[PDB]
Design a protein around this ligand. Structure first.
Ligand code: MG
Ligand code: MG
Ligand code: MG
Ligand code: MG
Ligand code: MG
Ligand code: MG
Ligand code: MG
Ligand code: MG
Ligand code: MG
Ligand code: MG
Ligand code: MG
Ligand code: MG
Ligand code: MG
Ligand code: MG
Ligand code: MG
Ligand code: MG
Ligand code: MG
Ligand code: MG
Ligand code: MG
Ligand code: MG
Ligand code: MG
Ligand code: MG
Ligand code: MG
Ligand code: MG
Ligand code: MG
Ligand code: MG
Ligand code: MG
Ligand code: MG
Ligand code: MG
Ligand code: MG
Ligand code: MG
Ligand code: MG
Ligand code: MG
Ligand code: MG
Ligand code: MG
Ligand code: MG
Ligand code: MG
Ligand code: MG
Ligand code: MG
Ligand code: MG
Ligand code: MG
Ligand code: MG
Ligand code: MG
Ligand code: MG
Ligand code: MG
Ligand code: MG
Ligand code: MG
Ligand code: MG
Ligand code: MG
Lengths: 271, 46, 93
RNA sequence: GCUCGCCGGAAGACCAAGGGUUCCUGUCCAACGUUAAUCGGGGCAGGGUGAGUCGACCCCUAAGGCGAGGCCGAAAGGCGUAGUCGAUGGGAAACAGGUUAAUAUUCCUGUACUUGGUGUUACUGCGAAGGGGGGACGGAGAAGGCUAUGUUGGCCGGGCGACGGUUGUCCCGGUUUAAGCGUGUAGGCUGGUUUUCCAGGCAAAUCCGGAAAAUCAAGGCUGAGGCGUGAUGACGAGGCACUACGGUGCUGAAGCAACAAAUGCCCUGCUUCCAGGAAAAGCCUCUAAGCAUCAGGUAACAUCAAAUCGUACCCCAAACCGACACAGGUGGUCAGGUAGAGAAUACCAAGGCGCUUGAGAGAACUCGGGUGAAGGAACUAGGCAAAAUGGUGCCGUAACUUCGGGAGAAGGCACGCUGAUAUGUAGGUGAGGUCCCUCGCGGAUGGAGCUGAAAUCAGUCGAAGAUACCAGCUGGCUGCAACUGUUUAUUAAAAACACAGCACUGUGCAAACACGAAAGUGGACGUAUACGGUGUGACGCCUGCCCGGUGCCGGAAGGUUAAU
RNA sequence: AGGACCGAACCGACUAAUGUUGAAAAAUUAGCGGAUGACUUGUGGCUGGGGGUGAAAGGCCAAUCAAACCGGGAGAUAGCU
């Protein structure tokens, strides 16, 4: 559900809130948590290497089954949980033989379903299997990129890939981003679309909001002094630059990708 | 009003103490000089 | 533990004072300067032998020697263990 | 010594950090002390810090640090694996009273408790660096039950009033008692036990997880306080003797109830929400290598052990940071009486103080204040500064609006005391007595006593009853910024920055980007509903035309063109 | 419920006067803003000088900052006083 908040107070009047009743209440399943410590965006040289990252809420990490290896063994959806560390919700699944696991909650997953993996597995929302055994045309999420390495593509709320060609030993995915890239067909992948999809109807509605998600403020270069940012100073609102990174590199359109090493695999660049 | 020197033994010995000087080339060198100039107190101690 | 050598070396001197005195009256306790490195045990042991009396319990503390700076250049008095030795009840020397 | 005044959510009392003898006594007065000083945080000498259970060491880990071998780097050196360090967090146990000139939960008295070694005895599967439990975790809000505490009555000791009255419905004081042990209440959570079987818990498992049945429903886990004991005790006014008049010894009454009541406790609870809320050991259990008449394991008793180092004193300051005995700064704990919403504020209590030159004068002028005829912004850059408003409850309140607001708009009305309803009302509280019963810290009945607003009527005093302190001035027009936030420590708090929102633009993950000769690492344990760069700045209504210039994207046939 | 309202603590720093060889190398007094949050604060850690950090003022990095402090090249050079 997607809710408007009443204007009982400015900075709460523009709040649009995504509240979901099918989500477990209370702490996750402890056995699957680790520590995760915040980083201010600083690396092992103590230097800020990525701007704007500080504070806001504390976060436990939940171990998520990106790989999906327990083939042949069914499991059922104990329940649906929120996860502070990503936009997708998640499924607490009980495997027949006792072992438990988290997985990315896909579009329609309800409590008490039966997901499964392996070179067989019923082609149904929730199930994992190699793509050489997935019908071209299918739409699939959490897509492995090397066989075995585990999910890397389409892991985010609302997203999915669509297989649009087999052929060869590789398939050819339509990436959420418009791109089309070949990818060896033994790379596993999941039936369905990744779940939470009204994610992108939230509005925050107030500055804090963003803070308490670890985001610190963004200072326009045109608000800095020449010394600081290539976008210079002013003297009653001036710019006159050719838009750039803080570090003399160009935005408004210069291309950055440079791999060669992985050019082979890309078949159509996004548009 | 709040001035710049706010003591703290724990921090002191960590920042300049004998052992910290010993940790490294250029702290061993602080000590080294101080010994050459014949200092009474190499560092600050118990 | 004996190391009778030690037990002889561990009792240094009696210690005199109001407190020390009233402490002998009221509490059948006796107060000694004892090696800095001595343990309550070592203190009990040697007191038993050397002073043939029965020791019920031993308390210690370390006295910090005062400081007396005489113009620019200063000086400090060294540090010693003070020893409260209680005497069981069979009370003698 | 007797007054007087000041603080009393502090100007008291405690901790911690920092200080390092400032502590206590004797003695001294040069210099230090904004004055004298016989005094002192000054000189000099002496005394003073006592712990199994307060703290630190110790065990555990956080961020972070170091780091065999290792990866990388002209040398220096940077990273980092196993490990090892690092509390600001987890981890065993003590209380009340007494005593010193100065230490005390440490010494004494009394009464406890913790975990180990040794033994004895009875009884048993014990056994990790491993598994599982657990330790183990946010915010907000709610209201019940409690205690700390206090009020009054009672009880006990004392009192009969410097001046009219005070043998009583009078006055004053006190009325305090711990840990521990026992009990398992208010209340919270969860159904239990047996058997069988299993792809999980790196091997193993009796444990955890999962699947089956069978069976009984009452079982367990947690848990403040009360009560009992501890206590034959301690403390307790006051007496009674001595007194170097400083004190010491001796003895010692009552020691209850009702009512009010935290912000403390039950509560690591409950309810609820999005931002979704440390780790590791101790601890319980489970087995592995193992050991099997041993060792161990469990329990009673008995016994030995618990080291070392801190402990004086200052504590929101004369001892700490401020060159000063400096109107500054400095985290945490304790919260009495009356009035009060209150931790505000005024006055007291306990406790601590009158701030280390005083004495007179009673000019100008300065500073800080009180009142002011008539006038009332005429002042002035500007109502700067003043003056004024100021509580509660009810009545009532416009434009405009994003329907929340505006709004405490504006403006009215009441306010003290006494009596009556009602010799104290509604409410709260709740004892005897009665009956029950799984009889308990139980239920129902019952209403004594206790406490107790608000209201209307009437009467009454003053110039005035939100009487002091304390405590909104209101309204109309209009610029800019949506808004709360941020900022020039020390002349700029704003219309500047940020901001939710929008847009462009890059980015397929070994991402772009960034710190890095590099290794390594942030980005991210993320993956295009994501992440970066840039500009715009809620929202409503909108966002037109120009690609010549400059930038950028695409292109390629020619032309020109490097090393070679 | 809320970057909700009023208002102590706490955080701040809008106005005036005082002070200006100060009580003080930025404060006192009376008024003022926030005061459940982008709040406030203890303890310890990390980032280092053409480097940091910066809700951006050239702000802050130990009474300082359009390039900290210390030592060194060092008796820099000074057609200037
Ligand atoms: Mg932005
Ligand atoms: Mg921006
Ligand atoms: Mg600027
Ligand atoms: Mg530049
Ligand atoms: Mg201009
Ligand atoms: Mg003892
Ligand atoms: Mg000791
Ligand atoms: Mg004080
Ligand atoms: Mg001295
Ligand atoms: Mg003098
Ligand atoms: Mg003194
Ligand atoms: Mg002295
Ligand atoms: Mg090495
Ligand atoms: Mg290292
Ligand atoms: Mg350690
Ligand atoms: Mg600690
Ligand atoms: Mg004392
Ligand atoms: Mg035994
Ligand atoms: Mg474990
Ligand atoms: Mg009570
Ligand atoms: Mg009379
Ligand atoms: Mg003390
Ligand atoms: Mg003074
Ligand atoms: Mg002072
Ligand atoms: Mg007050
Ligand atoms: Mg005086
Ligand atoms: Mg004075
Ligand atoms: Mg006046
Ligand atoms: Mg007048
Ligand atoms: Mg008049
Ligand atoms: Mg008038
Ligand atoms: Mg004029
Ligand atoms: Mg005029
Ligand atoms: Mg004014
Ligand atoms: Mg006024
Ligand atoms: Mg009345
Ligand atoms: Mg105008
Ligand atoms: Mg603004
Ligand atoms: Mg300024
Ligand atoms: Mg200002
Ligand atoms: Mg973005
Ligand atoms: Mg702008
Ligand atoms: Mg608010
Ligand atoms: Mg306020
Ligand atoms: Mg003020
Ligand atoms: Mg400065
Ligand atoms: Mg330069
Ligand atoms: Mg030279
Ligand atoms: Mg020169």
């Amino acid at each position: 559900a997607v809710v408007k908040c009443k204007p009982t107070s400015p900075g709460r009047r523009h709040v649009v809130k995504v509240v979901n009743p099918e989500l477990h209440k209370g702490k996750p399943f402890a056995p699957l948590l680790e520590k995760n410590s915040k980083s201010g965006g600083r690396n092992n040289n103590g230097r800020i290497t990525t701007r704007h990252i500080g504070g806001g809420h504390k976060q436990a990490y939940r171990i998520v089954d990106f790989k999906r290896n327990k083939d042949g063994i069914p499991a059922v959806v104990e329940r649906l949980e929120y996860d502070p560390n990503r936009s997708a919700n998640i499924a607490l699944v009980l495997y027949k033989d006792g072992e438990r696991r988290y997985i990315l909650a896909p579009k329609g997953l309800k409590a008490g379903d039966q997901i499964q993996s392996g070179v067989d597995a019923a082609i149904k929302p929730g199930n994992t299997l190699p793509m050489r055994n997935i019908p071209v045309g299918s739409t699939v999420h959490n897509v492995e990129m090397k066989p075995g390495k585990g999910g890397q593509l389409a892991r985010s709320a609302g997203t999915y890939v669509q297989i649009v060609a087999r052929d060869g030993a590789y398939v050819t995915l339509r990436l959420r981003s418009g791109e089309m890239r070949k990818v060896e067909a033994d790379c596993r992948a999941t039936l369905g679309e990744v779940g939470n999809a009204e994610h992108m109807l939230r509005v925050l509605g107030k500055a804090g909001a963003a803070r308490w998600r670890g985001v610190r403020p963004t200072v326009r270069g045109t608000a800095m002094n020449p010394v600081d940012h290539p976008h210079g100073g002013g003297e009653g609102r001036n710019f006159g630059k050719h838009p750039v990174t803080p570090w003399g590199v160009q935005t408004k359109g210069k291309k950055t990708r440079s791999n060669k090493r992985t050019d082979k695999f890309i078949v159509r660049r996004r548009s | 009003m709040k001035r710049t020197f706010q003591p703290s033994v724990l921090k002191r010995n960590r920042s300049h103490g004998f052992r910290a000087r010993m940790a490294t080339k250029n702290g061993r060198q602080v000590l080294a000089r101080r010994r050459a100039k014949g200092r009474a107190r190499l560092t600050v101690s118990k | 533990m004996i190391r009778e050598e030690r037990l002889l070396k561990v009792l240094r001197a009696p210690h005199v004072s109001e407190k020390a005195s009233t402490a002998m009256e009221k509490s059948n306790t006796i107060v000694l300067k004892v090696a800095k490195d001595a343990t309550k045990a070592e203190i009990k042991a040697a007191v038993q032998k050397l002073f043939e009396v029965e020791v019920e319990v031993v308390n210690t503390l370390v006295v910090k020697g005062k400081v007396k700076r005489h113009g620019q250049r200063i000086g400090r008095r060294s540090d010693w263990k003070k020893a409260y030795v209680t005497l069981k009840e069979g009370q003698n020397l």
